Amino acid sequence: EYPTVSEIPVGEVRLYQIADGVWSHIATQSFDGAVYPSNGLIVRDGDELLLIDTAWGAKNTAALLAEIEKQIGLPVTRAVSTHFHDDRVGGVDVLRAAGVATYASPSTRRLAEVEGNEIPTHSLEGLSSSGDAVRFGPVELFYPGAAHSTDNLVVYVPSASVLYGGCAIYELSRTSAGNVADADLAEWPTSIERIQQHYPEAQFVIPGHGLPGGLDLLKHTTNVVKAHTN
Ligand SMILES: C[C@H](CS)C(=O)N[C@@H](C(=O)O)c1ccc(F)cc1
Ligand SMILES: [Zn+2]
Ligand SMILES: [Zn+2]
Ligand SMILES: [Zn+2]
């Protein structure tokens, strides 16, 4: 069973193995009166691990590293943050202190700094234009256009047909718009179409928060945006 928000104490991280050499990591955090779950990704790259997003905060991210050591034993050597909010860069400084090389796009790095969030060290090149794709170790990084935020990236794992949508894709059980303070609500359905046109063969689709599904999460998310927008 995929771990749900009600089963993970704030401060603890679970790992869920999706495929061979592919896991999600799941944490929980208090935010704005509620507890929310949060997903990231872990992808094996031989004798090292590529981390996709922090576990939302310094303490959760240290827990993540401890859980990775317990359950996998391979070192995290690179990390990619998929947008500038705290559930994606909160913990970067812990990763850096632990010797992880932290990456984000130039936009994400700028927006993190503007906002006062932790800032990934290295800039990812080749992601400036909607539809750009880059092969980054075992994954493909993709910029679909502005949506949840103007900088959001998605991640695709070809070996396992895993599409990590981050917070530009909503789980089915969310039927209202959440955090749209930095969103391009008008562009968001267009960016979702772009993901669909590029990863039509996606089997396993991971939202930034909550339960994985399939490509039906894309259509579901547009409905939510439109319902909120119109
Ligand atoms: C703090 C974090 C940064 S994205 C955040 O605001 N998450 C937002 C959301 O993703 O819309 C969220 C709102 C309601 C939920 F049920 C789940 C997630
Ligand atoms: Zn190696
Ligand atoms: Zn966000
Ligand atoms: Zn989020």
Walk me through this protein's architecture.
Pfam families: Lactamase_B (PF00753). Mg(2+) 2 binds at residue 12. Its main location: periplasm. Zn(2+) 2 binds at residues 83, 85, 87, 148. It is an enzyme of class 3 (hydrolase). It is classed as hydrolase. This protein is of the alpha/beta class and 230 residues long. The protein has one domain (1-230): Metallo-beta-lactamase, Chain A (4-Layer Sandwich). It is 26% helix and 28% strand. The chain contains 6 helices and 12 strands. It has helices at residues 58-71, 86-89, 92-97, 106-115, 188-198, 216-229, and strands at 14-19, 22-31, 34-45, 48-52, 76-80, 101-104, 122-123, 133-136, 139-142, 154-157, 162-166, 204-207. The strands form 2 sheets. The chain has a 7-stranded mixed sheet with strand order 1-2-3-4-5-6-7. Helix 5 (188-198) runs antiparallel to helix 6. The chain is globular. It starts with 13 loop residues before the first strand and ends with a helix. The structure holds the ligand C[C@H](CS)C(=O)N[C@@H](C(=O)O)c1ccc(F)cc1 and zinc ion (ZN) (3 copies). The site of one zinc ion has 6 residues, from loops. Ligand 8PL binds next to loops.
